[PDB]
XYZ file of C-alpha atoms in Angstrom:
244
model
C 0.003 0.033 0.007
C 3.064 2.340 0.338
C 6.301 3.123 -1.439
C 9.385 1.120 -0.553
C 11.445 2.786 2.124
C 8.420 4.383 3.702
C 8.087 5.589 7.275
C 4.498 4.844 8.506
C 3.442 6.943 11.510
C 1.162 5.383 14.063
C -1.125 7.541 16.197
C -4.045 6.722 18.628
C -7.177 8.382 17.521
C -8.371 10.877 20.196
C -4.962 11.169 22.046
C -5.380 13.615 23.724
C -8.403 14.624 21.453
C -9.572 14.116 17.895
C -8.714 17.722 16.704
C -5.071 17.117 17.918
C -4.771 13.838 16.212
C -5.809 15.564 12.948
C -3.282 18.233 13.657
C -0.596 15.679 14.269
C -1.402 13.756 11.011
C -1.302 16.913 8.915
C 2.120 17.912 10.395
C 3.549 14.528 9.700
C 1.867 13.750 6.292
C 4.890 15.147 4.294
C 7.092 12.289 5.782
C 4.603 9.533 5.497
C 4.343 6.778 3.051
C 1.075 5.513 4.827
C -0.604 6.059 8.148
C -1.858 3.766 10.937
C -4.665 5.330 12.961
C -5.500 3.308 16.020
C -8.928 2.902 17.605
C -8.458 3.139 21.419
C -9.691 0.014 23.330
C -10.269 -0.704 26.981
C -8.101 -3.809 26.925
C -5.200 -3.411 24.483
C -3.355 -6.433 25.777
C -1.518 -6.865 22.542
C 0.214 -3.487 22.719
C 3.289 -2.120 24.368
C 3.111 -0.110 27.600
C 3.488 3.226 25.784
C 0.712 2.594 23.303
C -1.620 1.024 25.957
C -1.324 4.219 27.887
C -2.368 6.295 24.876
C -5.392 4.104 24.517
C -6.312 4.911 28.245
C -5.735 8.640 27.684
C -8.038 8.713 24.623
C -10.839 6.824 26.398
C -10.596 8.999 29.452
C -10.777 12.031 27.387
C -13.996 10.679 25.950
C -13.165 9.186 22.598
C -16.045 7.586 20.667
C -15.589 5.062 17.894
C -16.890 7.130 14.989
C -14.687 10.002 16.001
C -12.134 7.912 14.132
C -14.085 8.500 10.877
C -14.178 12.194 11.506
C -10.413 12.319 11.729
C -9.978 10.302 8.568
C -12.458 12.285 6.646
C -11.071 15.725 7.579
C -7.609 14.461 6.751
C -8.848 13.373 3.362
C -9.789 16.982 2.499
C -6.019 17.815 2.375
C -4.285 14.450 1.624
C -4.521 11.191 -0.174
C -1.808 9.297 1.884
C -2.885 5.642 2.416
C -4.694 5.160 5.718
C -4.999 1.941 7.707
C -7.389 1.832 10.624
C -5.893 -0.268 13.402
C -8.333 -1.805 15.913
C -9.178 -4.649 18.221
C -12.011 -6.859 17.160
C -14.464 -6.098 20.078
C -15.337 -2.576 18.866
C -15.831 -3.668 15.269
C -17.686 -6.815 16.213
C -20.091 -4.953 18.556
C -20.893 -2.189 15.963
C -21.464 -4.582 13.124
C -18.521 -5.462 10.795
C -20.381 -4.974 7.508
C -21.621 -1.418 8.513
C -18.257 -0.527 10.084
C -16.220 -1.233 7.021
C -18.724 0.453 4.650
C -18.523 3.446 6.835
C -14.737 3.163 7.044
C -14.524 3.002 3.335
C -16.901 5.978 3.103
C -14.741 8.252 5.351
C -11.721 7.385 3.254
C -10.029 4.386 5.018
C -7.913 2.302 2.605
C -7.073 -0.687 4.758
C -7.923 -2.255 8.106
C -5.883 -4.153 10.678
C -7.841 -6.198 13.304
C -5.235 -6.808 16.037
C -6.917 -9.831 17.480
C -9.201 -11.045 14.596
C -10.491 -14.520 15.739
C -9.174 -17.196 13.186
C -12.736 -18.565 13.349
C -13.874 -15.332 11.570
C -10.865 -14.611 9.373
C -12.276 -15.990 6.078
C -15.592 -14.287 6.241
C -13.939 -11.092 7.465
C -11.486 -10.751 4.577
C -14.369 -11.442 2.112
C -16.415 -8.689 3.659
C -13.449 -6.303 3.500
C -12.827 -6.972 -0.119
C -16.417 -6.449 -1.022
C -16.212 -3.166 0.804
C -13.089 -2.145 -1.086
C -11.070 -2.220 2.086
C -7.614 -3.769 1.970
C -6.591 -6.167 4.722
C -3.461 -5.882 6.921
C -2.589 -8.869 9.105
C -0.234 -9.057 12.109
C 2.532 -11.525 12.849
C 4.794 -11.637 15.922
C 8.231 -13.338 16.420
C 6.422 -16.494 17.643
C 4.617 -16.778 14.279
C 5.795 -19.881 12.377
C 6.562 -19.948 8.592
C 3.460 -22.053 7.954
C 1.305 -19.169 9.488
C 3.278 -16.390 7.735
C 2.279 -18.015 4.475
C -1.381 -18.324 5.488
C -1.306 -14.807 6.526
C 0.409 -13.606 3.282
C -2.279 -15.360 1.194
C -5.170 -13.542 2.998
C -3.297 -10.135 2.857
C -4.333 -7.536 0.312
C -2.812 -4.499 1.968
C 0.361 -5.526 3.582
C 1.755 -7.883 6.346
C 2.486 -6.086 9.577
C 5.359 -7.652 11.601
C 5.693 -6.670 15.274
C 7.883 -7.377 18.253
C 6.564 -6.835 21.817
C 10.226 -7.164 22.979
C 10.710 -3.512 22.656
C 14.506 -2.732 22.705
C 17.670 0.285 23.079
C 18.297 -2.126 20.183
C 16.006 -4.123 17.934
C 15.846 -7.692 19.300
C 17.427 -10.442 17.306
C 14.153 -12.288 17.475
C 12.594 -9.302 15.626
C 15.282 -9.430 12.867
C 14.570 -13.204 12.534
C 10.916 -12.521 11.895
C 11.693 -9.937 9.189
C 14.172 -12.292 7.532
C 11.691 -15.107 7.620
C 8.915 -12.991 6.427
C 10.893 -11.615 3.383
C 11.467 -15.225 2.275
C 7.876 -16.024 2.387
C 5.573 -13.050 1.784
C 4.708 -11.792 -1.721
C 2.902 -8.791 0.023
C 5.119 -5.864 1.275
C 5.808 -5.915 4.915
C 5.883 -3.138 7.500
C 7.730 -3.518 10.710
C 6.755 -2.177 14.239
C 9.755 -3.042 16.300
C 9.759 0.037 18.586
C 12.192 2.188 16.712
C 13.592 5.213 18.520
C 16.974 5.773 16.891
C 17.914 6.780 13.317
C 20.142 3.612 12.919
C 17.047 1.335 13.601
C 15.350 2.847 10.522
C 18.357 2.560 8.290
C 19.062 -0.950 9.539
C 15.518 -2.276 9.170
C 15.060 -0.893 5.620
C 18.422 -2.398 4.761
C 17.217 -5.821 5.896
C 14.176 -5.854 3.576
C 11.485 -3.979 5.445
C 9.296 -2.393 2.774
C 8.121 0.073 5.356
C 8.849 1.055 8.983
C 6.107 2.048 11.378
C 6.928 4.593 14.011
C 4.300 4.534 16.883
C 5.795 4.281 20.358
C 8.304 7.073 19.771
C 5.518 9.408 18.509
C 2.946 8.422 21.145
C 5.507 8.797 23.936
C 5.890 12.415 22.870
C 2.145 12.892 22.711
C 1.915 11.649 26.378
C 4.500 14.201 27.306
C 3.360 17.285 25.317
C -0.317 16.585 24.884
C -1.852 18.998 22.361
C 1.456 20.748 21.958
C 3.226 17.576 20.698
C 3.079 18.634 17.124
C 6.433 20.328 16.475
C 8.309 17.687 18.540
C 6.627 14.983 16.503
C 7.978 16.612 13.317
C 11.578 16.845 14.789
C 11.389 13.320 16.004
C 10.438 12.097 12.444
C 13.172 14.274 10.920
C 15.776 12.630 13.291
C 14.543 9.193 12.245
C 14.793 10.047 8.523
C 18.275 11.538 8.910
C 16.947 15.133 7.865
């Protein structure tokens, strides 16, 4: 879904508020090959501590599911950068999958990543996304075996998202292994979310085959520190990571 060598910013919708998220996206768009917008959830047990806390902030501040579409829609008035909505299944499942994706497509979403999509629903789900014109993005962690990476790749229409809960401040060997195994199996492009925080991480991961590199923790951490005034620091952080 994105150019090779892309830096993909990740932000939690509504952290600290929807208008700020929009401000952050617009300020970072010029450096993004694509964007992951996360829907805050009460139990983000698959995320790192930094991102989990941003989910809590957004929910405390009063975030509401559809405020995510407002953010995407408004962003779309100024940009066409690919957008991937990241979310836990619960919210989607409870609101009605079919209506959610149609609405997602309507507001401008290009792809969707369901962090904990139940295998039992995978097939039907991908079929529903395709009919809605929404590309699928599947997640794989270091404990994901080759056999599954292949099954994941064949279902993927957007891009395979490789992650590492290990955190760092260096990218763990287990994370490099996942990337190395995935590039040997996936036909789809792969994006990596290994908790980058230093310019050499970006240079290193792209060099090892990552089609794209997500930057979430580093940006969210700044948002938890600066709140609504995080904007400028977000831009500096991204420039540091791009060597510019």
